[PDB]
């Protein structure tokens, strides 16, 4: 097939336009995943006195305690709280009083959000195989736009949580289908590079969230501004071209020929396409015309690899989403810390790339995960008074975790046999999403100990780094094709 696609311009007009317009939506992906840092921030709040020096007990720091009002000039504060308006004019926390006793709800919502992402990874994955990549992409654009706009207009917390879960489902569908439709339309010799570009467009997305949230501090307007471009995306995405590989797989080669002829003229190489007919299409497409995930558990050689890669994905995503969404405690302005976090990835990916090529694949994962864990533990131990040390160490941890996300992507792409390679791509990635469902929840345990969430957030990556030992080195080795090749290693 690559033959034909190449025969049809290879990369060119239809390819540059579609690639740019399918990767453009991912610029807002990172803004949606990490939105609750700016739309759900906690301003310093104090108890509203009966309708402050007399009416507010003071804590060690001298500041007014947040959740206690003197019974007489203590008692649970039931008259509401005067949230500070200095920064964050309004965040869900302020709007729906998600503080004090219910403070945990602030995390719960995000958990629910990524729950949708996990669901959006599965259901809208299966739909992608039944209705076509383009139709599912169109529905994802429409669902993201509508759900985000409605969540910006939620009248109470449960509706906001449900609509954010729908937003997560639709955005996970977007993330999967953009990559799939982009890979399936490009030649293999430029497929891997596309993935790299994907990551970069995700990374730059963080910068966007740093900027927009500065200009639009209100949470409702920020949510609407972030989720409204998806309406224009749904408006312009009716013009996409269905992936011809899916059309061939479903058995409708007529639509494959139609799409190939359409890309032909688009690319200007019509005479070639026009020559491409049903007989030639069948002749060059007969040979191409994945095993079950149960095989991953059943085969012990595959079971060991699945367990190791699941632990790596889970730990990496868990620590990453633990660090990305703790921005206020570093002591610097959260917009600046967001800009810095976005800027870590560009050199972090280069360092990971260089290490992966030079030293190896397994040592790169080991070093990245162990460094992330040690940075995390030392951030947990170093007192808050040292601001530059905590900021630098958290930044280094985030960079190491981004390098891990890539290293584990490449590692799990080259480790699995070709029969189960794509399914292993899914479940491993699925484990990552499962990690991001557990990451906020464990955060809730803070009320127990201020530093416990960081302690677990670093204990898990160290365990993953230790687990990495069992994995086999893949540098200089061809990709495997069967279980026997794995056993030979
Ligand atoms: N280069 C990156 C790609 C994806 C992610 C991520 O957050 N993935 C979770 C999911 O989208 O299910 C992070 C960095």
UniProtKB/Swiss-Prot annotation:
Topological category with respect to the lipid bilayer: Multi-pass membrane protein
Catalytic activity: (6R)-L-erythro-5,6,7,8-tetrahydrobiopterin(out) + a dicarboxylate(in) = (6R)-L-erythro-5,6,7,8-tetrahydrobiopterin(in) + a dicarboxylate(out); L-erythro-7,8-dihydrobiopterin(out) + a dicarboxylate(in) = L-erythro-7,8-dihydrobiopterin(in) + a dicarboxylate(out); L-sepiapterin(out) + a dicarboxylate(in) = L-sepiapterin(in) + a dicarboxylate(out); prostaglandin F2alpha(out) + a dicarboxylate(in) = prostaglandin F2alpha(in) + a dicarboxylate(out)
BP-aspect Gene Ontology terms: alpha-ketoglutarate transport; metanephric proximal tubule development; monoatomic anion transport; organic anion transport; prostaglandin transport; renal tubular secretion; sodium-independent organic anion transport
Pfam families for the chain: Sugar_tr (PF00083)
Cytoplasmic compartment spans: 1-7, 129-136, 186-196, 242-304, 357-362, 414-422
Stated consequence of mutating residue 48 to H: Lower Vmax; increase in substrate affinity and increase in the affinity for the nucleoside phosphonate analogs cidofovir, adefovir and tenofovir
Record flagged with keyword Manganese: no
GO molecular function, one term: xenobiotic transmembrane transporter activity
Effect of residue 28 to A: Complete loss of PAH transport activity
The UniProt record lists the keyword Isomerase: no
Tissues in which the UniProt entry reports expression: Strongly expressed in kidney. Expressed at lower level in liver, skeletal muscle, brain and placenta. In kidney, found at the basolateral membrane of the proximal tubule. In testis, primarily localized to the basal membrane of Sertoli cells and weakly expressed in Leydig cells and vascular endothelial cells.
Record-annotated membrane-spanning stretches: 8-28, 108-128, 137-159, 163-185, 197-217, 221-241, 305-325, 336-356, 363-383, 393-413, 423-442, 452-472
Listed GO CC annotations: basal plasma membrane; basolateral plasma membrane; caveola; extracellular exosome; plasma membrane; protein-containing complex
Glycosylation sites: 37, 85
Outcome following mutation: residue 265 to W: Increase in substrate affinity
Keywords: Cell membrane, Glycoprotein, Membrane, Transmembrane, Transmembrane helix
Modification after translation: Glycosylated. Glycosylation at Asn-85 may occur at a secondary level. Glycosylation is necessary for proper targeting of the transporter to the plasma membrane.
Extracellular side: 29-107, 160-162, 218-220, 326-335, 384-392, 443-451
UniProt site positions, description: Important for interaction with cidofovir: 202
Result, substituting residue 202 to A: Loss of membrane protein expression and little uptake of cidofovir
Alphabetized NCBIfam families for the sequence: 2A0119
More details: Involved in the renal transport of a variety of drugs with well-known nephrotoxic potential, therefore may play a role in the etiology of the drug-associated nephrotoxicity. Uptakes the diagnostic agent PAH/para-aminohippurate and clinically used drugs. Mediates the pH- and chloride-dependent bidirectional transport of PAH/para-aminohippurate in exchange for 2-oxoglutarate or glutarate as counteranions. Can also mediate PAH/cGMP exchange.
Swiss-Prot/TrEMBL domain comment: Multiple cysteine residues are necessary for proper targeting to the plasma membrane.
Family: Belongs to the major facilitator (TC 2.A.1) superfamily. Organic cation transporter (TC 2.A.1.19) family.
UniProt name for this protein: Solute carrier family 22 member 6
Record organism: Homo sapiens
């Amino acid at each position: 097939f690559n033959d034909l696609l190449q025969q049809v311009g290879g990369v060119g007009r239809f390819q540059q336009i579609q690639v740019t317009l399918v990767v453009l939506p991912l610029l807002l992906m990172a803004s949606h995943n990490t939105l609750q840092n700016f739309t759900a921030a906690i301003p310093t709040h104090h108890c509203r006195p009966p309708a402050l020096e007399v009416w507010l007990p003071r804590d060690r720091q001298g500041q007014p305690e947040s959740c206690l009002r003197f019974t007489s000039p203590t008692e649970p504060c039931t008259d509401g709280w005067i949230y500070d308006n200095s920064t964050f004019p309004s965040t869900i926390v302020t709007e729906w009083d998600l503080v004090c006793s219910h403070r945990a709800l602030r995390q719960l919502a995000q958990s629910l959000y990524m729950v949708g992402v996990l669901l959006g990874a599965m259901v809208f994955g299966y739909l992608a195989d039944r209705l076509g990549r383009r139709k599912v992409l169109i529905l994802n654009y429409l669902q993201t736009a509508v759900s985000g706009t409605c969540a910006a207009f939620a009248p109470n917390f449960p509706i906001y949580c449900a609509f954010r879960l729908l937003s997560g489902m639709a955005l996970a569908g977007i993330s999967l289908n953009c990559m799939t439709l982009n890979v399936e339309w490009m030649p293999i010799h430029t497929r891997a590079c596309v993935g790299t570009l994907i990551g970069y467009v995700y990374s730059l997305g963080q910068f966007l969230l740093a900027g927009v949230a500065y200009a639009v501090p209100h949470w409702r307007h920020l949510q609407l501004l972030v989720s409204a471009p998806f309406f224009a995306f749904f408006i312009y995405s009716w013009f996409f071209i269905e992936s011809a590989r899916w059309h061939s797989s479903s058995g409708r080669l007529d639509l494959t020929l139609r799409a190939l002829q359409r890309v032909a003229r688009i690319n200007g190489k019509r005479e070639e396409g026009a020559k491409l007919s049903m007989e030639v299409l069948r002749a060059s497409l007969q040979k191409e015309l994945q095993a079950s995930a149960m095989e991953l558990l059943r085969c012990p050689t595959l079971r060991h690899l699945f367990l190791c890669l699941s632990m790596l994905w889970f730990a990496t995503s868990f620590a990453y989403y633990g660090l990305v969404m703790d921005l206020q405690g570093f002591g610097v302005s959260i917009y600046l810390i967001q800009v810095i976090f976005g800027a870590v990835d560009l050199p972090a990916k280069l360092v990971g790339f260089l290490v992966i090529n030079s030293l190896g694949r397994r040592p790169a994962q080991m070093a990245a995960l162990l460094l992330a864990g040690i940075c995390i533990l030392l951030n947990g131990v170093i007192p808050q008074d040292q601001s530059i040390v905590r900021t630098s160490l958290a930044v280094l941890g985030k960079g190491c975790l981004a390098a891990s996300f890539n290293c584990i992507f490449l590692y799990t792409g080259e480790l699995y046999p070709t029969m189960i390679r794509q399914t292993g791509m899914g479940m491993g990635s699925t484990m990552a999403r499962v990690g991001s469902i557990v990451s906020p929840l464990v955060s809730m345990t803070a009320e127990l100990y201020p530093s416990m969430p960081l302690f677990i957030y670093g204990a898990v990556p160290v365990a993953a780094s230790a687990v990495t030992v069992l994995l086999p080195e893949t540098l200089g080795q061809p990709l495997p094709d069967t279980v026997q090749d794995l056993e030979s290693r």
